[PDB]
Amino acid sequence: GGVTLFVALYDYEARTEDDISVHKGEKVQILNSSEGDWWEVRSLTTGETGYVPSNYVAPVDGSAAMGPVLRLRAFYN
């Protein structure tokens, strides 16, 4: 099957040469989630890659979201 996409929850502004800026709502592909705190991602709006805080992204779909979110997603699908 295809990639599981993630979405930026919050705006994040890159401060160094290692991180990347993302804007809330932008989708990303996860490249390296082998650290808990910082994840390497590909921006699906710029094509750039770099690290963002793991807590600033969440899966777009799937099954780990709280029950009310799963129910609302199903209702509007």
PDB file of N, CA, C and O in Angstrom, residues 6-65:
ATOM      1  N   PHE A   6       1.244  12.329   7.148  1.00  0.00           N
ATOM      2  CA  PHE A   6       1.077  13.111   8.362  1.00  0.00           C
ATOM      3  C   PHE A   6       0.761  14.554   8.007  1.00  0.00           C
ATOM      4  O   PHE A   6       0.956  15.004   6.876  1.00  0.00           O
ATOM      5  N   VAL A   7       0.299  15.280   8.994  1.00  0.00           N
ATOM      6  CA  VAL A   7      -0.089  16.680   8.777  1.00  0.00           C
ATOM      7  C   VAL A   7       0.564  17.493   9.895  1.00  0.00           C
ATOM      8  O   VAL A   7       0.615  17.056  11.098  1.00  0.00           O
ATOM      9  N   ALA A   8       0.955  18.691   9.574  1.00  0.00           N
ATOM     10  CA  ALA A   8       1.451  19.653  10.544  1.00  0.00           C
ATOM     11  C   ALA A   8       0.288  20.195  11.406  1.00  0.00           C
ATOM     12  O   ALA A   8      -0.662  20.776  10.873  1.00  0.00           O
ATOM     13  N   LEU A   9       0.394  20.021  12.727  1.00  0.00           N
ATOM     14  CA  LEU A   9      -0.612  20.471  13.663  1.00  0.00           C
ATOM     15  C   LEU A   9      -0.523  21.947  13.939  1.00  0.00           C
ATOM     16  O   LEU A   9      -1.570  22.584  14.248  1.00  0.00           O
ATOM     17  N   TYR A  10       0.677  22.473  13.879  1.00  0.00           N
ATOM     18  CA  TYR A  10       1.026  23.787  14.299  1.00  0.00           C
ATOM     19  C   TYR A  10       2.058  24.302  13.317  1.00  0.00           C
ATOM     20  O   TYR A  10       2.917  23.543  12.833  1.00  0.00           O
ATOM     21  N   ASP A  11       2.153  25.606  13.212  1.00  0.00           N
ATOM     22  CA  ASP A  11       3.267  26.217  12.524  1.00  0.00           C
ATOM     23  C   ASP A  11       4.576  25.953  13.259  1.00  0.00           C
ATOM     24  O   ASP A  11       4.630  25.974  14.476  1.00  0.00           O
ATOM     25  N   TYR A  12       5.629  25.645  12.509  1.00  0.00           N
ATOM     26  CA  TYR A  12       6.930  25.455  13.073  1.00  0.00           C
ATOM     27  C   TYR A  12       7.890  26.248  12.203  1.00  0.00           C
ATOM     28  O   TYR A  12       7.954  26.027  11.002  1.00  0.00           O
ATOM     29  N   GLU A  13       8.729  27.107  12.819  1.00  0.00           N
ATOM     30  CA  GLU A  13       9.700  27.884  12.063  1.00  0.00           C
ATOM     31  C   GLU A  13      11.091  27.326  12.298  1.00  0.00           C
ATOM     32  O   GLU A  13      11.552  27.208  13.430  1.00  0.00           O
ATOM     33  N   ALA A  14      11.784  26.980  11.205  1.00  0.00           N
ATOM     34  CA  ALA A  14      13.124  26.473  11.308  1.00  0.00           C
ATOM     35  C   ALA A  14      14.022  27.537  11.950  1.00  0.00           C
ATOM     36  O   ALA A  14      13.918  28.698  11.654  1.00  0.00           O
ATOM     37  N   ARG A  15      14.823  27.086  12.880  1.00  0.00           N
ATOM     38  CA  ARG A  15      15.800  27.987  13.586  1.00  0.00           C
ATOM     39  C   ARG A  15      17.248  27.704  13.185  1.00  0.00           C
ATOM     40  O   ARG A  15      18.123  28.590  13.424  1.00  0.00           O
ATOM     41  N   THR A  16      17.550  26.527  12.608  1.00  0.00           N
ATOM     42  CA  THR A  16      18.888  26.109  12.276  1.00  0.00           C
ATOM     43  C   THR A  16      18.936  25.556  10.856  1.00  0.00           C
ATOM     44  O   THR A  16      17.979  25.718  10.092  1.00  0.00           O
ATOM     45  N   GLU A  17      20.024  24.909  10.476  1.00  0.00           N
ATOM     46  CA  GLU A  17      20.154  24.343   9.185  1.00  0.00           C
ATOM     47  C   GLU A  17      19.648  22.890   9.146  1.00  0.00           C
ATOM     48  O   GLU A  17      19.677  22.284   8.111  1.00  0.00           O
ATOM     49  N   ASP A  18      19.253  22.351  10.301  1.00  0.00           N
ATOM     50  CA  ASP A  18      18.844  20.955  10.422  1.00  0.00           C
ATOM     51  C   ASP A  18      17.311  20.782  10.326  1.00  0.00           C
ATOM     52  O   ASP A  18      16.852  19.674   9.957  1.00  0.00           O
ATOM     53  N   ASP A  19      16.569  21.817  10.675  1.00  0.00           N
ATOM     54  CA  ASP A  19      15.101  21.733  10.764  1.00  0.00           C
ATOM     55  C   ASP A  19      14.504  22.329   9.495  1.00  0.00           C
ATOM     56  O   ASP A  19      15.194  22.842   8.650  1.00  0.00           O
ATOM     57  N   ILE A  20      13.187  22.160   9.364  1.00  0.00           N
ATOM     58  CA  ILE A  20      12.440  22.703   8.256  1.00  0.00           C
ATOM     59  C   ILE A  20      11.220  23.413   8.787  1.00  0.00           C
ATOM     60  O   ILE A  20      10.620  22.959   9.739  1.00  0.00           O
ATOM     61  N   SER A  21      10.797  24.467   8.069  1.00  0.00           N
ATOM     62  CA  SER A  21       9.571  25.168   8.398  1.00  0.00           C
ATOM     63  C   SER A  21       8.381  24.433   7.820  1.00  0.00           C
ATOM     64  O   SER A  21       8.435  24.017   6.646  1.00  0.00           O
ATOM     65  N   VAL A  22       7.307  24.329   8.581  1.00  0.00           N
ATOM     66  CA  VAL A  22       6.048  23.828   8.094  1.00  0.00           C
ATOM     67  C   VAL A  22       4.956  24.771   8.628  1.00  0.00           C
ATOM     68  O   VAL A  22       5.064  25.402   9.702  1.00  0.00           O
ATOM     69  N   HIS A  23       3.835  24.826   7.896  1.00  0.00           N
ATOM     70  CA  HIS A  23       2.704  25.621   8.250  1.00  0.00           C
ATOM     71  C   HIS A  23       1.598  24.665   8.612  1.00  0.00           C
ATOM     72  O   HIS A  23       1.405  23.608   7.982  1.00  0.00           O
ATOM     73  N   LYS A  24       0.756  24.999   9.590  1.00  0.00           N
ATOM     74  CA  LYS A  24      -0.295  24.273   9.979  1.00  0.00           C
ATOM     75  C   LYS A  24      -1.172  23.833   8.791  1.00  0.00           C
ATOM     76  O   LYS A  24      -1.495  24.678   7.903  1.00  0.00           O
ATOM     77  N   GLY A  25      -1.501  22.545   8.726  1.00  0.00           N
ATOM     78  CA  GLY A  25      -2.291  21.936   7.683  1.00  0.00           C
ATOM     79  C   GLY A  25      -1.519  21.303   6.539  1.00  0.00           C
ATOM     80  O   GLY A  25      -2.089  20.540   5.769  1.00  0.00           O
ATOM     81  N   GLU A  26      -0.257  21.671   6.373  1.00  0.00           N
ATOM     82  CA  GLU A  26       0.561  21.084   5.315  1.00  0.00           C
ATOM     83  C   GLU A  26       0.777  19.600   5.606  1.00  0.00           C
ATOM     84  O   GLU A  26       1.049  19.212   6.758  1.00  0.00           O
ATOM     85  N   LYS A  27       0.765  18.804   4.542  1.00  0.00           N
ATOM     86  CA  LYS A  27       1.078  17.405   4.685  1.00  0.00           C
ATOM     87  C   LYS A  27       2.567  17.127   4.520  1.00  0.00           C
ATOM     88  O   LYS A  27       3.308  17.875   3.847  1.00  0.00           O
ATOM     89  N   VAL A  28       3.029  16.083   5.201  1.00  0.00           N
ATOM     90  CA  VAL A  28       4.415  15.673   5.189  1.00  0.00           C
ATOM     91  C   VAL A  28       4.502  14.153   5.063  1.00  0.00           C
ATOM     92  O   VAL A  28       3.596  13.462   5.493  1.00  0.00           O
ATOM     93  N   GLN A  29       5.603  13.665   4.488  1.00  0.00           N
ATOM     94  CA  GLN A  29       5.956  12.255   4.559  1.00  0.00           C
ATOM     95  C   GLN A  29       7.019  12.083   5.635  1.00  0.00           C
ATOM     96  O   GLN A  29       7.973  12.849   5.720  1.00  0.00           O
ATOM     97  N   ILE A  30       6.866  11.067   6.471  1.00  0.00           N
ATOM     98  CA  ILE A  30       7.875  10.762   7.500  1.00  0.00           C
ATOM     99  C   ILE A  30       9.021   9.990   6.888  1.00  0.00           C
ATOM    100  O   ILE A  30       8.817   8.965   6.222  1.00  0.00           O
ATOM    101  N   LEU A  31      10.234  10.449   7.150  1.00  0.00           N
ATOM    102  CA  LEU A  31      11.462   9.821   6.626  1.00  0.00           C
ATOM    103  C   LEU A  31      12.237   9.053   7.695  1.00  0.00           C
ATOM    104  O   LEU A  31      12.969   8.115   7.397  1.00  0.00           O
ATOM    105  N   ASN A  32      12.186   9.604   8.896  1.00  0.00           N
ATOM    106  CA  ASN A  32      13.007   9.056  10.019  1.00  0.00           C
ATOM    107  C   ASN A  32      12.305   9.429  11.334  1.00  0.00           C
ATOM    108  O   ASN A  32      12.435  10.566  11.778  1.00  0.00           O
ATOM    109  N   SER A  33      11.633   8.437  11.918  1.00  0.00           N
ATOM    110  CA  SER A  33      10.936   8.620  13.208  1.00  0.00           C
ATOM    111  C   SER A  33      11.598   7.760  14.301  1.00  0.00           C
ATOM    112  O   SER A  33      10.971   7.359  15.270  1.00  0.00           O
ATOM    113  N   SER A  34      12.892   7.466  14.145  1.00  0.00           N
ATOM    114  CA  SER A  34      13.641   6.625  15.074  1.00  0.00           C
ATOM    115  C   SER A  34      14.098   7.355  16.328  1.00  0.00           C
ATOM    116  O   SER A  34      14.649   6.707  17.231  1.00  0.00           O
ATOM    117  N   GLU A  35      13.854   8.649  16.417  1.00  0.00           N
ATOM    118  CA  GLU A  35      13.964   9.409  17.699  1.00  0.00           C
ATOM    119  C   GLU A  35      12.586   9.813  18.122  1.00  0.00           C
ATOM    120  O   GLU A  35      11.713  10.136  17.286  1.00  0.00           O
ATOM    121  N   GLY A  36      12.328   9.857  19.433  1.00  0.00           N
ATOM    122  CA  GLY A  36      10.985  10.180  19.888  1.00  0.00           C
ATOM    123  C   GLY A  36      10.611  11.623  19.690  1.00  0.00           C
ATOM    124  O   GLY A  36       9.436  11.902  19.452  1.00  0.00           O
ATOM    125  N   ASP A  37      11.571  12.537  19.804  1.00  0.00           N
ATOM    126  CA  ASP A  37      11.309  13.966  19.921  1.00  0.00           C
ATOM    127  C   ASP A  37      11.368  14.750  18.600  1.00  0.00           C
ATOM    128  O   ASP A  37      10.612  15.711  18.431  1.00  0.00           O
ATOM    129  N   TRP A  38      12.269  14.342  17.713  1.00  0.00           N
ATOM    130  CA  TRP A  38      12.551  15.029  16.505  1.00  0.00           C
ATOM    131  C   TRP A  38      12.480  14.045  15.341  1.00  0.00           C
ATOM    132  O   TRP A  38      13.158  13.028  15.415  1.00  0.00           O
ATOM    133  N   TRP A  39      11.694  14.394  14.315  1.00  0.00           N
ATOM    134  CA  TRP A  39      11.465  13.512  13.148  1.00  0.00           C
ATOM    135  C   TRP A  39      11.935  14.167  11.876  1.00  0.00           C
ATOM    136  O   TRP A  39      11.661  15.347  11.681  1.00  0.00           O
ATOM    137  N   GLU A  40      12.576  13.414  11.001  1.00  0.00           N
ATOM    138  CA  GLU A  40      12.918  13.944   9.656  1.00  0.00           C
ATOM    139  C   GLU A  40      11.704  13.705   8.767  1.00  0.00           C
ATOM    140  O   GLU A  40      11.187  12.583   8.680  1.00  0.00           O
ATOM    141  N   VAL A  41      11.289  14.739   8.063  1.00  0.00           N
ATOM    142  CA  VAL A  41      10.153  14.714   7.178  1.00  0.00           C
ATOM    143  C   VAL A  41      10.476  15.381   5.834  1.00  0.00           C
ATOM    144  O   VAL A  41      11.420  16.128   5.682  1.00  0.00           O
ATOM    145  N   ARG A  42       9.660  15.061   4.845  1.00  0.00           N
ATOM    146  CA  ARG A  42       9.593  15.707   3.554  1.00  0.00           C
ATOM    147  C   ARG A  42       8.318  16.547   3.526  1.00  0.00           C
ATOM    148  O   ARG A  42       7.211  15.993   3.716  1.00  0.00           O
ATOM    149  N   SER A  43       8.496  17.863   3.219  1.00  0.00           N
ATOM    150  CA  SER A  43       7.347  18.721   3.006  1.00  0.00           C
ATOM    151  C   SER A  43       6.689  18.391   1.673  1.00  0.00           C
ATOM    152  O   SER A  43       7.306  18.444   0.634  1.00  0.00           O
ATOM    153  N   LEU A  44       5.391  18.139   1.706  1.00  0.00           N
ATOM    154  CA  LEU A  44       4.614  17.886   0.501  1.00  0.00           C
ATOM    155  C   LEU A  44       4.097  19.192  -0.102  1.00  0.00           C
ATOM    156  O   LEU A  44       3.374  19.087  -1.094  1.00  0.00           O
ATOM    157  N   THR A  45       4.575  20.336   0.356  1.00  0.00           N
ATOM    158  CA  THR A  45       4.300  21.602  -0.346  1.00  0.00           C
ATOM    159  C   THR A  45       5.556  22.302  -0.844  1.00  0.00           C
ATOM    160  O   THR A  45       5.406  23.158  -1.706  1.00  0.00           O
ATOM    161  N   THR A  46       6.763  21.926  -0.377  1.00  0.00           N
ATOM    162  CA  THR A  46       7.986  22.570  -0.842  1.00  0.00           C
ATOM    163  C   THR A  46       8.990  21.593  -1.430  1.00  0.00           C
ATOM    164  O   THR A  46       9.884  22.042  -2.170  1.00  0.00           O
ATOM    165  N   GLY A  47       8.919  20.309  -1.103  1.00  0.00           N
ATOM    166  CA  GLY A  47       9.903  19.361  -1.532  1.00  0.00           C
ATOM    167  C   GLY A  47      11.184  19.402  -0.730  1.00  0.00           C
ATOM    168  O   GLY A  47      12.068  18.578  -1.016  1.00  0.00           O
ATOM    169  N   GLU A  48      11.246  20.219   0.292  1.00  0.00           N
ATOM    170  CA  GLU A  48      12.402  20.240   1.133  1.00  0.00           C
ATOM    171  C   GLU A  48      12.245  19.184   2.227  1.00  0.00           C
ATOM    172  O   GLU A  48      11.171  18.667   2.523  1.00  0.00           O
ATOM    173  N   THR A  49      13.376  18.842   2.834  1.00  0.00           N
ATOM    174  CA  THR A  49      13.419  17.834   3.918  1.00  0.00           C
ATOM    175  C   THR A  49      14.208  18.405   5.084  1.00  0.00           C
ATOM    176  O   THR A  49      15.067  19.283   4.981  1.00  0.00           O
ATOM    177  N   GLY A  50      13.811  17.945   6.275  1.00  0.00           N
ATOM    178  CA  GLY A  50      14.521  18.297   7.471  1.00  0.00           C
ATOM    179  C   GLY A  50      13.718  17.855   8.673  1.00  0.00           C
ATOM    180  O   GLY A  50      12.681  17.187   8.550  1.00  0.00           O
ATOM    181  N   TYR A  51      14.187  18.238   9.849  1.00  0.00           N
ATOM    182  CA  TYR A  51      13.592  17.828  11.088  1.00  0.00           C
ATOM    183  C   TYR A  51      12.541  18.804  11.605  1.00  0.00           C
ATOM    184  O   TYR A  51      12.631  20.014  11.426  1.00  0.00           O
ATOM    185  N   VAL A  52      11.501  18.221  12.182  1.00  0.00           N
ATOM    186  CA  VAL A  52      10.474  18.929  12.902  1.00  0.00           C
ATOM    187  C   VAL A  52      10.224  18.229  14.217  1.00  0.00           C
ATOM    188  O   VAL A  52      10.519  17.038  14.363  1.00  0.00           O
ATOM    189  N   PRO A  53       9.581  18.909  15.199  1.00  0.00           N
ATOM    190  CA  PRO A  53       9.235  18.203  16.429  1.00  0.00           C
ATOM    191  C   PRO A  53       8.201  17.137  16.077  1.00  0.00           C
ATOM    192  O   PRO A  53       7.197  17.416  15.425  1.00  0.00           O
ATOM    193  N   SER A  54       8.385  15.928  16.643  1.00  0.00           N
ATOM    194  CA  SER A  54       7.393  14.898  16.411  1.00  0.00           C
ATOM    195  C   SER A  54       5.994  15.289  16.877  1.00  0.00           C
ATOM    196  O   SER A  54       4.988  14.903  16.294  1.00  0.00           O
ATOM    197  N   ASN A  55       5.947  16.052  17.955  1.00  0.00           N
ATOM    198  CA  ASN A  55       4.643  16.419  18.495  1.00  0.00           C
ATOM    199  C   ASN A  55       3.957  17.470  17.644  1.00  0.00           C
ATOM    200  O   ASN A  55       2.813  17.813  17.961  1.00  0.00           O
ATOM    201  N   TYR A  56       4.581  18.026  16.604  1.00  0.00           N
ATOM    202  CA  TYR A  56       3.947  18.982  15.755  1.00  0.00           C
ATOM    203  C   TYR A  56       3.340  18.322  14.520  1.00  0.00           C
ATOM    204  O   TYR A  56       2.790  19.071  13.675  1.00  0.00           O
ATOM    205  N   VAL A  57       3.372  17.006  14.411  1.00  0.00           N
ATOM    206  CA  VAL A  57       2.719  16.305  13.309  1.00  0.00           C
ATOM    207  C   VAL A  57       1.891  15.151  13.850  1.00  0.00           C
ATOM    208  O   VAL A  57       2.151  14.636  14.935  1.00  0.00           O
ATOM    209  N   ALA A  58       0.850  14.770  13.118  1.00  0.00           N
ATOM    210  CA  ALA A  58      -0.018  13.644  13.479  1.00  0.00           C
ATOM    211  C   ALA A  58      -0.448  12.971  12.206  1.00  0.00           C
ATOM    212  O   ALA A  58      -0.457  13.585  11.122  1.00  0.00           O
ATOM    213  N   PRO A  59      -0.823  11.688  12.256  1.00  0.00           N
ATOM    214  CA  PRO A  59      -1.256  10.999  11.068  1.00  0.00           C
ATOM    215  C   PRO A  59      -2.532  11.656  10.560  1.00  0.00           C
ATOM    216  O   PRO A  59      -3.365  12.105  11.293  1.00  0.00           O
ATOM    217  N   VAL A  60      -2.702  11.650   9.249  1.00  0.00           N
ATOM    218  CA  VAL A  60      -3.907  12.194   8.662  1.00  0.00           C
ATOM    219  C   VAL A  60      -5.144  11.338   8.980  1.00  0.00           C
ATOM    220  O   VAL A  60      -6.231  11.919   9.255  1.00  0.00           O
ATOM    221  N   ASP A  61      -4.972  10.043   8.953  1.00  0.00           N
ATOM    222  CA  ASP A  61      -6.140   9.161   9.085  1.00  0.00           C
ATOM    223  C   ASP A  61      -5.689   8.059  10.019  1.00  0.00           C
ATOM    224  O   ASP A  61      -4.925   8.310  10.953  1.00  0.00           O
ATOM    225  N   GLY A  62      -6.108   6.818   9.753  1.00  0.00           N
ATOM    226  CA  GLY A  62      -5.669   5.712  10.620  1.00  0.00           C
ATOM    227  C   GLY A  62      -6.602   5.553  11.797  1.00  0.00           C
ATOM    228  O   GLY A  62      -7.780   5.980  11.709  1.00  0.00           O
ATOM    229  N   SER A  63      -6.090   5.020  12.916  1.00  0.00           N
ATOM    230  CA  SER A  63      -6.970   4.517  13.979  1.00  0.00           C
ATOM    231  C   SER A  63      -6.531   4.855  15.418  1.00  0.00           C
ATOM    232  O   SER A  63      -7.146   4.420  16.354  1.00  0.00           O
ATOM    233  N   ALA A  64      -5.523   5.709  15.623  1.00  0.00           N
ATOM    234  CA  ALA A  64      -5.030   6.034  16.959  1.00  0.00           C
ATOM    235  C   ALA A  64      -5.641   7.316  17.545  1.00  0.00           C
ATOM    236  O   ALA A  64      -5.455   7.638  18.718  1.00  0.00           O
ATOM    237  N   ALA A  65      -6.377   8.067  16.735  1.00  0.00           N
ATOM    238  CA  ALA A  65      -7.035   9.290  17.208  1.00  0.00           C
ATOM    239  C   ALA A  65      -8.123   8.923  18.204  1.00  0.00           C
ATOM    240  O   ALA A  65      -8.620   7.773  18.209  1.00  0.00           O
TER     241      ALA A  65
END
